[PDB]
Design an enzyme around this catalytic site. Sequence first.
Site, short mmCIF file in Angstrom:
data_model
loop_
_atom_site.label_atom_id
_atom_site.label_comp_id
_atom_site.label_asym_id
_atom_site.label_seq_id
_atom_site.Cartn_x
_atom_site.Cartn_y
_atom_site.Cartn_z
N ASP A 254 -13.32 -15.23 1.80
CA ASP A 254 -14.35 -14.33 2.35
C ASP A 254 -15.71 -14.45 1.66
O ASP A 254 -16.76 -14.28 2.31
CB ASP A 254 -13.90 -12.87 2.27
CG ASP A 254 -13.24 -12.39 3.53
OD1 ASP A 254 -13.74 -12.71 4.63
OD2 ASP A 254 -12.21 -11.69 3.42
N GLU B 259 -17.90 -10.25 6.21
CA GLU B 259 -17.22 -11.14 5.27
C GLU B 259 -17.50 -10.77 3.81
O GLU B 259 -16.57 -10.54 3.03
CB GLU B 259 -17.57 -12.61 5.51
CG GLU B 259 -17.37 -13.16 6.93
CD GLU B 259 -15.94 -13.09 7.46
OE1 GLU B 259 -15.19 -12.17 7.11
OE2 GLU B 259 -15.58 -13.94 8.29
N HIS C 240 -15.42 -7.16 3.57
CA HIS C 240 -14.10 -7.73 3.28
C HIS C 240 -13.93 -8.13 1.83
O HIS C 240 -12.99 -7.66 1.18
CB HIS C 240 -13.81 -8.95 4.16
CG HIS C 240 -13.75 -8.64 5.62
ND1 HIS C 240 -13.63 -9.62 6.58
CD2 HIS C 240 -13.84 -7.46 6.29
CE1 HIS C 240 -13.62 -9.06 7.78
NE2 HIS C 240 -13.76 -7.75 7.63
N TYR D 84 -11.44 -6.02 -1.56
CA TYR D 84 -10.43 -6.52 -2.49
C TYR D 84 -10.67 -6.03 -3.89
O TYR D 84 -9.71 -5.76 -4.60
CB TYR D 84 -10.32 -8.05 -2.49
CG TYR D 84 -10.04 -8.65 -1.13
CD1 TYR D 84 -8.87 -8.35 -0.43
CD2 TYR D 84 -10.96 -9.53 -0.54
CE1 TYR D 84 -8.63 -8.90 0.83
CE2 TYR D 84 -10.73 -10.08 0.71
CZ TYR D 84 -9.56 -9.77 1.38
OH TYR D 84 -9.32 -10.33 2.62
N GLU E 13 -10.45 -18.61 9.56
CA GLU E 13 -10.25 -17.26 10.13
C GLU E 13 -8.81 -17.00 10.58
O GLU E 13 -8.24 -15.92 10.34
CB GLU E 13 -11.18 -17.03 11.34
CG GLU E 13 -12.69 -17.00 11.01
CD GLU E 13 -13.14 -15.67 10.38
OE1 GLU E 13 -12.30 -14.75 10.18
OE2 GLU E 13 -14.36 -15.52 10.12
N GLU F 86 -10.87 -10.48 11.52
CA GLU F 86 -10.76 -11.95 11.52
C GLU F 86 -10.24 -12.47 12.84
O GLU F 86 -10.66 -13.54 13.27
CB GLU F 86 -9.89 -12.49 10.38
CG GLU F 86 -10.01 -11.81 9.03
CD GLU F 86 -11.33 -12.06 8.26
OE1 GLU F 86 -12.40 -12.38 8.85
OE2 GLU F 86 -11.27 -11.89 7.01
N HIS G 140 -13.20 -12.63 15.05
CA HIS G 140 -14.09 -13.69 14.51
C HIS G 140 -13.59 -15.08 14.89
O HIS G 140 -14.39 -15.94 15.27
CB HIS G 140 -14.16 -13.65 12.98
CG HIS G 140 -14.82 -12.43 12.43
ND1 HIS G 140 -15.06 -12.28 11.08
CD2 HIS G 140 -15.28 -11.30 13.02
CE1 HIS G 140 -15.64 -11.11 10.86
NE2 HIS G 140 -15.77 -10.49 12.02
MN LIG Z 1 -14.01 -13.71 9.45
MN LIG Z 2 -13.26 -11.75 6.36
#
Ligand SMILES: [Mn+2]
Ligand SMILES: [Mn+2]
Lengths: 683, 683, 289, 289
Positions: free
Chosen positions: C51, C82, C86, C90, C149, C183, C186
Amino acid sequence: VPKWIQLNNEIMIQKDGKFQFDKDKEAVHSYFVDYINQNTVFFHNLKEKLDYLVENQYYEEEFLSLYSFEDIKEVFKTAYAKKFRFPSFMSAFKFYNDYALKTNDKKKILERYEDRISIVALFFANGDTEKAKEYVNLMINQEYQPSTPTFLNAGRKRRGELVSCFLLEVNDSLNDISRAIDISMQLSKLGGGVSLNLSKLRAKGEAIKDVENATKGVVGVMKLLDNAFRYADQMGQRQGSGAAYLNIFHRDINDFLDTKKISADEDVRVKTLSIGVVIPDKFVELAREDKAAYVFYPHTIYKEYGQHMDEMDMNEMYDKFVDNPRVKKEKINPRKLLEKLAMLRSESGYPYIMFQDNVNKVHANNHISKVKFSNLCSEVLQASQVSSYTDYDEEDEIGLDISCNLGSLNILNVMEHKSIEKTVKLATDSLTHVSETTDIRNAPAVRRANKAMKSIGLGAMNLHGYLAQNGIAYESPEARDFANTFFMMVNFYSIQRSAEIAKEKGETFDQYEGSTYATGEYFDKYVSTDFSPKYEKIANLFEGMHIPTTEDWKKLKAFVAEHGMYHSYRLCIAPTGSISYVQSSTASVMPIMERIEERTYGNSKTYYPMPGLASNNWFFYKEAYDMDMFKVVDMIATIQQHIDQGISFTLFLKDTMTTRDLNRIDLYAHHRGIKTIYYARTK
Amino acid sequence: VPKWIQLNNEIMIQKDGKFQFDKDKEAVHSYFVDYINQNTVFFHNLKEKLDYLVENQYYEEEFLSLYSFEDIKEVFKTAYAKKFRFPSFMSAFKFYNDYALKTNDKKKILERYEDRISIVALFFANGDTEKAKEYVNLMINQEYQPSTPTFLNAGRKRRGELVSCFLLEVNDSLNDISRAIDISMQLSKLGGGVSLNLSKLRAKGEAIKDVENATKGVVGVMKLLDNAFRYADQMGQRQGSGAAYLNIFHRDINDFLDTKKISADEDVRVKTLSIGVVIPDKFVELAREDKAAYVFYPHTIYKEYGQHMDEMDMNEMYDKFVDNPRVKKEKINPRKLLEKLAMLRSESGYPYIMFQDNVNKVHANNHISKVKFSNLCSEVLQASQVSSYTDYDEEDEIGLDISCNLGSLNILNVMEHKSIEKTVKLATDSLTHVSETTDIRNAPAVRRANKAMKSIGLGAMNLHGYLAQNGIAYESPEARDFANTFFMMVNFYSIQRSAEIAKEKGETFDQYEGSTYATGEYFDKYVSTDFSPKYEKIANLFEGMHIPTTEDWKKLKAFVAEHGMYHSYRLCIAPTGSISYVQSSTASVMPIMERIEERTYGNSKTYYPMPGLASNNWFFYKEAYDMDMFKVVDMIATIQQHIDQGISFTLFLKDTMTTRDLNRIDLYAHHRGIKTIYYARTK
Amino acid sequence: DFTQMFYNQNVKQFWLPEEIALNGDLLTWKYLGKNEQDTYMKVLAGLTLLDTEQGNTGMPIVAEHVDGHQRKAVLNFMAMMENAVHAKSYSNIFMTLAPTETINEVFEWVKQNKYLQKKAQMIVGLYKAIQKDDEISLFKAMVASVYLESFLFYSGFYYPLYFYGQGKLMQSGEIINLILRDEAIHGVYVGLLAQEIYNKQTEEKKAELREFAIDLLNQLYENELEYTEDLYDQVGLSHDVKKFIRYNANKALMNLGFDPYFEEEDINPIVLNGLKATVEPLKDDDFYF
Amino acid sequence: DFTQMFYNQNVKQFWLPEEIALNGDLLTWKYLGKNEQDTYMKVLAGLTLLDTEQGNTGMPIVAEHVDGHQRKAVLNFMAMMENAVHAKSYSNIFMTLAPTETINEVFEWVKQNKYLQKKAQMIVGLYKAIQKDDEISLFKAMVASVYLESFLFYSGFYYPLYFYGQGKLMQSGEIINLILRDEAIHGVYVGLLAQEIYNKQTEEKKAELREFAIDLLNQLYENELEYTEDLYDQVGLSHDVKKFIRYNANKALMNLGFDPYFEEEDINPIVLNGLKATVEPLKDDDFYF
Ligand SMILES: [Mn+2]
Ligand SMILES: [Mn+2]
Ligand SMILES: Nc1ncnc2c1ncn2[C@@H]1O[C@H](COP(=O)(O)OP(=O)(O)OP(=O)(O)O)[C@@H](O)[C@H]1O
Ligand SMILES: Nc1ncnc2c1ncn2[C@@H]1O[C@H](COP(=O)(O)OP(=O)(O)OP(=O)(O)O)[C@@H](O)[C@H]1O
Ligand SMILES: Cc1cn([C@H]2C[C@H](O)[C@@H](COP(=O)(O)OP(=O)(O)OP(=O)(O)O)O2)c(=O)[nH]c1=O
Ligand SMILES: [Mg+2]
Ligand SMILES: [Mg+2]
Ligand SMILES: [Mn+2]
Ligand SMILES: [Mn+2]
């Protein structure tokens, strides 16, 4: 910029390579000839002033009604006869900004220093004109200083409470937790700092009536108390300050500490509640031997034994807890916990460290209860009994919640006047009066403990100022000898005054008969060891004053055995933060943080030199951070051997030293008998 | 994936272009052939089962001891003689996952549906075997459903309270705020949802003991309450749920509302505290005429008039408040405030809207008090008196805190059995028994109001289910005609049962003589307007049941005049969250949100079609979001004209409609007499 | 025919990790074995890396070369998701569950892990090889992006889904499901752009592009097998994860308009079980009915 | 010291065009004179055209050359707001107020306009001149970006704020206020990134960069005065608009850590109404004294 501000800033402008300390004096003159005298409110005579302050709800009329106006006039004349002058600009500034009485709109000054001292003395004497004059002479000479609550609020109608610190025991129940929150809000409303012992609360993952893993632990109660102290913030004037104390053997001790980590999440982080850790000698022994320790679940121990974990001696019951399968426990590394404590103190100055066994090996009232926690400044160490707050429509079992009145001796002024005995006795009488007139209607355990224990705290300030102004290094053995002798004298005369009050009132404090005062054990080291100065310089410093010997201590022990003691606790050395400015004294018995402190007020900056700082005593005013913390620990232990309660001992650390150095200082403090450690301030 | 879950997910698989609804039935069989029977603990006889449940602290001994074992066995046999079968998988799953009694290890099933129903019936009857059998026939026919607290906890030793809706009045004091926090914690500990009225609390910037700009407002109290509700979370089982209600003329109303904005800071936003706004008719008039409104400081009004702002009629008091110089107020735009309410409801569904005058123009107990706020579900609307909780060792003035008793009629099952009268009277008796057996020892005002008012809430559910299975659109005038007739009969028989209980026990609710029941005003619209169905279809629906006429209502009015009324409040329509699944019914009187709802449990996906959904009635099961909210408001007002308390009325909005549409729905609800608006759920 | 509906779908799916409280996972995390926690941390770290590069490099560079303000707006939005949503989520998970030293160690581990470095080298290399006005280099990078992805994330996604499916780590799992939902759209969108370019080619050129796509997939696949074994052998799941990545490889090919390459297999049913408003002012006529 | 804080402020300011209903503006639009409608259209097109450059080039080019994952994420978020939110918002305002043919003509006019083109191309020229691994060229582009975000937009923002402060065109004025609030934070953030580069330079290089910034400001300012008279003389506002330009020029300079260039002036009140110690383990024998 004001003229006095420029004169005060002229100190740092060096002339011939030397600081212009005398300019400071000029500043005070300016501060009085341009601001204070113009902003003061003058009346035709004292009668009009007193009437205006009484009808306008500035003063309580009850304490003034005990004296005829002639007596009040005589007291005020005695206060003004000294012609007291503030030697530094910051002393007068701090008094007239924090303690002098102002109008409702705070546009004018109604109280001078002499007026405030006279009012406090008249409140203290409780109708005795001669006693009021004695208090006036004691405070105008600046031998004794009542605490900020007492000095600021005595005799005022809009006053708060005169008690500075309150200590609450929280029982392991929702009713008790809610009552503790309520009492904390009530006492923060009264302006006092509240300390709560959370060691009885069961840890996270305990059972609430047979449903397991249900409790939020001490962290949920910590969040509740933090919000309560945030809400009750002295009507938005001073931020609500609370303290939470947890035993190091509590299972939540890590989570407790995690409340002060700078990386803590918002659901765990607590920001307005100070944290303290109570460390028994068992934990230090386990860390020393590197044997893995066990933290315990309080509710399992209470179920198995019928008593709380902090209600009994861990040094004798730790092995029984570990070997008991019905007691739940978690494995920890005591050395890792010590390192976590050192890291937390380096990062934020928390937790407070209370060496429980150091407190209780010399505690005189272990029969009533062992000292399980300290106050917000970690200097109050008294017996407390937890209260059983039951359901509504059920009678509550009211225990003992610690509360003492603070008052500090100015060591320089006391020894200059050669009046240790008179100052100590008068301060004890004033603190006894403050305790007697204190009645808190929303804290039942605090009220009962105030009525029964009759505990007072008589501190001391200007130790470093006196030592530096007399050419004695604070770390020198001569300084420790002086502290030993002076505080033995203070303890002797405080015990004598307590016994005299008990004799004159025919009453002692509750459960005095089981105390070490009644059995004579307390006087053991005083009837076998001589505390007269071992150095000729210190003995000369104590000339003109009768230093008590072992025979005087034996006579005092017999007198106490015959008459008892009025106060369960007498001496506690508070930090004395802002009132030390008015007295032109160094804060508490701690060494000075800096020789000249630069403080920003409004848009201006001011420099306060340490009291008596000059060229000849520049290096005797050694900064605390430059000092060896081991010798400061030695000084604090020397003082502590004569103080029944604790001393607010702040550690002054350099940025270069590691957490291992902090741990070594803590372990040396524990070895030397230090009861509590207040702060780890890093330069 | 288990077999029953596959059979349930086979519903969405379309055969011949139609959903396999009947497959759901097969799933139930699997759910009982594979799981329920395997994990159900069986005993040799009912005596052994009862002994095991009583001895292992599952049941209570007291309620079972009132019957001989033969009577208990007869009640259980009556329950099992119905051979009740859950028609859908989700009904049985919800019962056996939420309500069926399980062992301490939560792996075995101790209670079937018949066992739980028999136990609840035996608890209801309080020693009457015939009454217990009547309750068993009522609940096994699924005509009446006790609320989740009553249904889950009746007859169980390890249980919370049977009441879960609590309304607290908070007086403007620190003692009262702390007591409110304590009571909220105690009631959340019991498992109840707590609603607190914060309108009496003075706004931010008010005086405490004549010091200005000292109060933190209601937002600090909301933070304290949010922390208390987070702490008290049913022993770590469900998230602590609380509600706070503020009058829209309180000055904090914006900051109040600002607690629900996403952009609000961490020291402003409360996450577990629902908020509701009380809107008097004066605010709606000011917004309608576009005149700028004033939000008042409650403490100034209290000082000027001696009464709280929410304790007097704002319609006649607003001009006097505005023209009073001693009342402090701030200028606001009422239309801007309405737009802010609509925007906040669009974002988060908050606040709940209480139309004060809509509630109080039909309130029967305005003499006791006007309804100032609602509950957490915004359907309890009762008179409440604030309590004066004083300091310690001082007697408190205990007021009235609302706590009504929930229970819902299943309209489909009630009407297909032609048993409106019998079901309503038996439900009233059960609610009276549960109210009488409720004793809360930590909420004094809640207990006092439960003893005095004897208020119960008898709700209804499966309205949309019944209408759709009878070929009636929820928005049709025929549906409103049916609701009018059905709920007029429900009100008639509820009043008749209340008067019969008052005659039997010889006592009414406290201060009944001042109520509109005693004066006969309540029956005015009932003795002049005939509520018989105006459509032939609805009349045929009511065939076989006597519909009370104006003469019957006159006789009931005379009966109430002669004998009084036992319950201050009788009817309130709760949301009925999870009990609607077990009863295979649509939730409350609300229209269905989805025809088939998709849920995710643990591993699995599961599919619940609405009860009775098929190809023939697919069109009549219109989703709530597709419906015209004006016609939903019309139906809810039609029901509300026969309900003494409020109805949990959730708005169902599309993402396309703006805040103007939400405000229009709110204003039409206010115009049509809607008392409360619960939620704004956006699709 | 599709950008507007993707624009609307992307913006309506907007979320932030802070919307999900994570302290609820604390106990189910504490209860996992050391092997399980290790694999979990490493799996999410591998995802974070992917990501990071998709947000910093992949999506912005594709946005630069694709024509049309609306297409660019969709690609810019996806890029923001991203790295701003995303990749950051994490860290929210890590900061909740793990002590700082374990977090530091896992980020050091991504730098030195040969399979993770190889896959980043290959994907980012193709992104940086795009030449202005050269549709073939752009197609190759879009294939790489679809493979990132719709294929490469899945060796990582398996484990949070596997736990979610068992009722474990469900708050972290909720975050992961939101990431996966993003994703999926995407991969479809970039797939449609790739097909646009492919459809412009001669049959001969198309044949070469299929060769490129299949060769690249196989090369990435072989590396992913070794990565999967390295992470999952210690928790006993490598064979199961391998079936999952093959399943998703077929979805990536389909997103590119190509036939499935791997045969169908039964996936662990636990993993399958793991799967402001517009404002108008009030008129005076809205107060009357 | 600042990127995570700006991340927070940026994401919490997220909004979408659909949230504000625009149709109610027609109730005040119909009452404006031809010159007022003409100026508004021209100003709006000016803002639209400049903001498109920032979305397609300005923000993405800076994100490309700045090092740091967290900075790239914030910059990506800002680029997203330009392309996905601001651009759609400007289009929505136009489509509400003018018919299609009028929109096309206004954009044709503003596209040919000498003063709009001069500033648009000056800014774009500096973005195109950034060289890989050359922080001086990056700094110059950041200065250009700050000047656009914090200064050049404001000759345009003046008019919608002027109406907004009078109770006219309130829906589009609310939209413009949200856009302006985003550009303000964009300008401050890019300003901090420029100061970081500036502070890494020698004293001679600093003096040279200051001269660059002041020279650029002067060129843009003199063109703004001409742009201002060209648009605002017909509605009699140019004097007050000029005060607003200088006030915002000073803010832009302060964003770049520079002193204000222009004397302080009061602004039109209608427009105002619109507006860790080293951890060392215990070694034993530390418990003995
Ligand atoms: Mn993506
Ligand atoms: Mn992502
Ligand atoms: N340092 C100071 N501390 C306290 N009060 C002061 C101080 N300096 C000045 N004042 C006040 O301001 C007045 C100004 O008088 P000043 O000290 O200059 O001497 P004076 O007029 O000769 O009289 P006296 O010293 O006898 O009061 C003092 O009388 C006193 O009330
Ligand atoms: N839909 C259902 N709802 C409730 N319980 C069910 C259902 N289906 C089966 N059961 C339970 O499983 C048992 C088996 O029922 P089944 O359909 O096999 O036939 P039966 O004639 O009702 O059986 P039994 O001899 O148990 O009465 C029922 O008695 C009941 O306890
Ligand atoms: C009610 C409640 C209690 N507790 C914890 C805090 C208290 O210290 C502890 C004791 O609660 P108690 O009030 O003593 O609960 P109880 O008396 O009903 O249960 P028991 O008989 O076991 O004493 O439980 C929570 O953590 N959350 C809660 O919601
Ligand atoms: Mg208890
Ligand atoms: Mg009061
Ligand atoms: Mn923009
Ligand atoms: Mn911008």
